[PDB]
Subunit: 362 residues, 4 copies
């Protein structure tokens, strides 16, 4: 999550004083508001940037005089993010988008005066808008529901956000939380900032726990759906083999090595393809080929050589009808679908092969 | 599990003809019964051995005239296992055990006439007896209960074992299943042998599924008991570091590499200790040290260098107060308590670090 | 080289007593002579074998009454090598060879009565005879010259071999040195055996020194014939690259890693293909591909990806016109022509890349 | 080598026109002369820098009004190197040195008016002067002799340098070659620059060839000085070992793996410490420990474990009396002294172990 501190004050010294305490509290972004860009020049964003190079500075240009030139004036003064309005012409948005690409600067677009905010949000994602800014309305939070469920890019929210209302906007999927007077008008703006970051870590702990249990739920399904042909086909091939070669691609290769390390303890004549001591593949040897897609070129080339040498091939893959699957004598189908398809495949194979070891040890 | 075919026939030519069909069905051991060692000589054991060199031949010498001379004659004729009685004197048991030790031959001892079957099995385990043979009694299976719960060595069972009664003795923990007339006196002895092996694989499928869910249940516990101080300490150290070095011992090292591969995709300046491209540890770098015991010498030595260079150390360990834990600035405790202590730590850390990656990608 | 002790004594108890002292001195083979296989039976070969299982026992059957029956009796009594005559019929030679093949036993054939010793040895090599035995003649050693220069299999020598005449037969290429009374009829047969082994190591020291200088002489030739276009092409590509990827096959890969370790110390953005931390190949990156043949499939496949990504490829190979060479933008040709073709390329490249490092450090 | 183009013209447009052609010819450094820094301001170095960011710009401040302030004025305008006089006060030199450290800028010091140029050069190296500038005098080149042989930092030379005199100053060890009118007053300044760089590559080819032969000369000395105790001690230990473990540190570890790969082809039971399949070190195993210094902590710890397990240790080291040497049963002393001591040790071990392989193959 990202905490953006809106410095809506007209006092330049009061604004920098607040940002310094908020920065110690853990705030990520600092917004130079429109009341600060009219009195002070564009150097207002440069004063904040040269003082806080570790933070991203957001230039609030949510006024109608803003064109592609004012957006470039922000980037040259050190603005990392520039905010504009959605009611502006599409021509000015793409012109601001091209200027942003020349400087590596993000673009935020507000929907404060948009009739159909939902429809407008989708086309903004098409041109390359980085963030969408919506307001809470403190039917409050109704807008945050639909715009978030409509687009994939991060959505920023603002409007009466305090330690009381911030947990709500997080539950609805807001990425950027813009808070103003709740920090700027407090006795300890740094202390209030830490409580907001503590709320962020309440969500982070839920994310990691949910990520862990989402993987373990998938692995329980793999275990419940294992077939006798697959398990026995692998075990009988391992026992009847002269040498055992294991070959996996990328992270699958680390899983293969972790399995080989255990097989060595059971006095199997096992080797890892690609390491120093790997001997020549001969007749009667077994190749355990691990590839989630079943199309990895190096894994397929190794399986083809093993068949030509008069050996057996066991393919661990998610696609039994893949090129690797059609070569194998035994196909162990591990499904791959929080976590990507590859991560589920690698971790499921990891614990499946540990189940294989437990079986051999009994 | 082990399938032992009892050849109680007195015809030697019929015994080898039937043993050949049972061997094709997947039988592991072949027993030359006492009615075969009295009509035929000790050459009955040598004829079976030279015919089935890949099979283990069991010489049934379960009579009371058996001494060290008859036991030594079996090993010299090619018997891999010799079965004797438990009611014999302890002197003859160690004399048969010492004779067996001279040939690398196992010794099976039956408890058919033992008063207290539980006690006798345990003291047999003390002298070094390899296997204990008990009978079903077809209160049937009561003995199989207590002998299994009393010793750690494999327990052999025999007595009215067919396709209906074999599943029960497997459920009670018998390792060696001795089947006679159910195979030897059947119209298709090879088909019955395959069906008995199919019964073995019904238990194997239960073992591997139970092995997998035992690991995932422990990881769910790890997720529920993760601490915010530890998780945030690791993440904040990772974000605030110049270079990130990851170093694990053995199988833990493969887990560390799997985490490093993902961190590289997230544009971290990450390296794996021990690989070719690893640069020098400087001030502001972070060492993530992974060691279940927290006492691995190489991992501890790397943590000491990292501290002397003015760097941070995060220890992922099962022992927070270990030598590695006491050096670390942040300790991520992966709790402990079918699978060994090392396997649970490695698999829990693997899925925990995948939860960390899921958090960083949000 | 092999030291064979001829036990031509008729006393069996004296033969084993002397063979025990020769074995402690380091003798490899023990020959039970014909005067021992006629007075004593074929059990002379079994008594020696069960006494020296780590030694190879040679059964001297060099008489003309020897047929397939006597040769088979030696293998069944534990003879590892059987010596017969070259003047026998070819039918009995292949019959002894086929009998030997059934036991995994070698066959030695003497040429004591052969008309044309050169021709007979070569046709013996065609049938699969393992060793050729010739006699010194103490024009002595003339036969040892021609038989050695005629066949590829080891040549055994015998005839007046003591500490003065053994160095000469070694210089002429004899592999098996058969010594009799110089050991068996001496005051210290164990000491004489150690002195004969010391003679073997005088030749070994010459072999290893000659092996090393053969490699360094080839590398001096590589240095003298290096081309400015190749060397500068590699250096200029290295300096002008964003990332440098190094990829070698097998032992060439270890050489590539050794070069990568040094380049990292020179502040190059260098990575090794196949290791954990290797990132994605982008535009402006360089692939240094090392392959002696220029046909290694994985190396060729990596060069093709590097070209499709808009990168440069430098191929270090022995074949400029190979598949890898034709893909490369720069080809560094490491020339070819005791050491195999692979060893010369790997060691020449290793020292060439160390010359490159010395240049860069200046 | 470095080619520095002195732009001594007073015309700013003529100076930038010359530097653009010289840059295409391969010139490394561009010097903004004093006749350019008096007419134009310090922006003269900024105009060259913003036009040639790929080149290092040298600010010629060899006048007496130069203090620490003028040196800082050059760095803020983009000067990568600043040149001053040696006849200035030592106070101004260290003040310029401290300013250079704040900006990462090099300092060049001329000896045009120094009485004893040799003596003055040494103390300049003590304070941290990066380069020493001397003049040819076209007894010309006499100054270049003594100043180069007195200091270790790079020495820059200037004065009548043309395609005729440049080969001479290179032979005397000049690092930076400053050429003016020979390029600036030619019909093709880019073409003349390429001929100077071609002269540089005539020296580079000599450097790499000399580096290669310096290594091979050292290896021939190692071969000539090998001892029977070392070679036989290693070979007898390898043959009499159950398992063979190889463990080297850093680049020595790659040499160890290259040797292990060859030993595997000879059917040795050989393993590499640190890889996946490495089994447990048991009684009767051999550890080949490779460490140039004989003090590498991980190598010493592995040798100590091997001795406690009842195994043998062979140490390949340059220091027989090191900690590793005192542990070993056999010490193979490889000397380590163009190339560092480690490079000579690693490459000598590399070809020695290839001599060992050739010996075993005979
Ligand atoms: Mg705002
Ligand atoms: Mg029975
Ligand atoms: Mg002879
Ligand atoms: Mg000058």
């Amino acid at each position: 999550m990202i905490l953006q501190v809106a410095l809506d004050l007209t006092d330049i010294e009061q604004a920098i004083s607040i940002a310094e305490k908020a920065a110690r509290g853990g705030a990520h972004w600092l917004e130079v508001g429109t009341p600060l860009i009219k009195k002070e020049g564009m150097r207002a964003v440069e004063l904040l940037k040269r003082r806080f190079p570790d933070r991203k500075i957001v230039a609030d240009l949510k006024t109608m005089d803003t064109g592609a030139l004012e957006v470039e004036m922000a980037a040259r003064h050190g603005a990392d993010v520039v905010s504009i309005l959605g009611v502006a012409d599409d021509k000015t948005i793409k012109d601001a988008l091209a200027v942003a690409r020349k400087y590596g600067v993000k673009i935020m677009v507000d929907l404060i005066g948009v009739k159909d905010k939902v429809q407008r949000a989708k086309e903004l994602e098409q041109m390359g808008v980085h963030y969408i800014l919506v307001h809470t309305g403190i039917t409050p939070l109704e807008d945050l529901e639909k715009v978030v469920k409509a687009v994939k890019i991060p959505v920023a929210v603002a409007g009466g956000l305090n330690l009381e209302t911030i947990p709500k906007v997080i539950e609805l999927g807001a990425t950027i939380v813009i808070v103003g007077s709740a920090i700027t008008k407090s006795k300890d703006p740094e202390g209030v900032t830490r409580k907001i970051i503590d709320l962020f870590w309440d969500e982070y702990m839920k994310t990691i726990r949910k990520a862990m249990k989402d993987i373990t739920d998938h692995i329980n399904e793999v275990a419940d759906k294992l077939r006798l042909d697959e398990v026995r086909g692998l075990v009988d091939a391992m026992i009847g083999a002269n040498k055992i070669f294991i070959y996996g691609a990328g992270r699958s290769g680390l899983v293969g090595k972790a399995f080989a390390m255990r097989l060595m303890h059971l006095d199997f004549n096992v080797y890892v393809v690609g390491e120093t001591i790997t001997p020549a593949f001969e007749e009667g040897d077994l190749l355990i080929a691990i590839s989630g897609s079943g199309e990895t070129k190096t894994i397929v080339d190794a399986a083809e050589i093993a068949k030509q040498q008069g050996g057996k091939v066991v393919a661990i893959t998610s696609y039994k009808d893949s090129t690797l699957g059609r070569l194998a004598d035994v196909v162990v189908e591990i499904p791959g679908r929080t976590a990507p398809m590859g991560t589920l495949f690698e971790d499921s194979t990891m614990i499946f092969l540990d189940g294989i070891i437990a079986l051999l040890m009994a």
